[PDB]
Design a protein around this ligand. Sequence first.
Ligand SMILES: CCCCCCCC/C=C/CCCCCCCC(=O)OC[C@H](O)CO
Ligand SMILES: CCCCCCCC/C=C\CCCCCCCC(=O)OC[C@H](O)CO
Ligand SMILES: CCCCCCCC/C=C\CCCCCCCC(=O)OC[C@H](O)CO
Lengths: 143, 132
Amino acid sequence: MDWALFLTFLAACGAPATTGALLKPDPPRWVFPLAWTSLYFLMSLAAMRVAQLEGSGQALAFYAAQLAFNTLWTPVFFGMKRMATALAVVMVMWLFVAATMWAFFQLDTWAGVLFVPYLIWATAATGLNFEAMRLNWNRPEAR
Amino acid sequence: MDWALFLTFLAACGAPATTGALLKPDPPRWVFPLAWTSLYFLMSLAAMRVAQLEGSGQALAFYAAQLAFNTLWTPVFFGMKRMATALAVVMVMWLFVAATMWAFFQLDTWAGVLFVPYLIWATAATGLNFEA
Ligand SMILES: CCCCCCCC/C=C/CCCCCCCC(=O)OC[C@H](O)CO
Ligand SMILES: CCCCCCCC/C=C\CCCCCCCC(=O)OC[C@H](O)CO
Ligand SMILES: CCCCCCCC/C=C\CCCCCCCC(=O)OC[C@H](O)CO
């Protein structure tokens, strides 16, 4: 554990948490932020553990990547409602979430375990968006 | 010294580059993407160098943070046009860019030099957002 690292990783999660606060997507109303606080805590904890180990550069490169495409996804799907663009982003995102998880696993089992529920959300995100997709596949404004 | 690392960091820049492709700001028209193409390679080269050194965790935590608030800033300023919210974002973004830069500097001089033109953009970004 290191407080600088952890606080740094959680602070970074404020970027996608903001997206969600602003473009509230779309069940009692505490479930969504409670689900997200847990996810942000779990992944900041995992990155913090991994950030201290030798050989972690690649996993941390993956972590930056999933984090940025996470932040991108919400405003492209729910903001611009550009469903095709948003499909590519979410699959690229899903790929880095999985990549992070697996690279975490190969350095630290706990770090990988702590990312499983986040891969589950990313799988939800992809599913939702695959549909929105080819309901709107023929409207090039949605694309 | 590593294509995986580099290609992974450059791929990550695709997220904020996408924002820019979508919410077109605002001068010969190749200038905008040429500057951003330059900015993305420079910062991926720098991240690549640092990711290989030991003690790099804190700088790489910084790198992730600026990247996300970079990605966040454009859709909040140009997308949602919420000028106040976007001010907090861009100041938070500016701060992590400077931090990435300085922590890179402490591990590898070249990595730090390679972030200066990006700190310069980040200051422009902050400057723009203050008059709005
Ligand atoms: C390493 C070589 C691979 C590189 C090339 C492959 C690119 C990776 C993309 C994968 C997308 C996987 C799909 C993500 C999960 C699907 C979600 C889904 O189908 O279920 C949700 C549905 O709404 C439930 O009701
Ligand atoms: C200011 C620095 C403080 C350091 C602490 C960092 C604060 C951000 C992290 C999590 C807490 C907020 C979680 C509340 C729920 C956010 C909602 C959300 O994330 O929405 C999902 C989004 O759409 C999917 O990209
Ligand atoms: C190996 C996989 C890599 C695949 C390749 C992905 C590389 C994407 C990054 C460079 C493209 C250059 C884009 C230049 C024009 C971008 C315009 C833009 O970035 O706008 C600025 C944005 O608004 C401010 O955040």
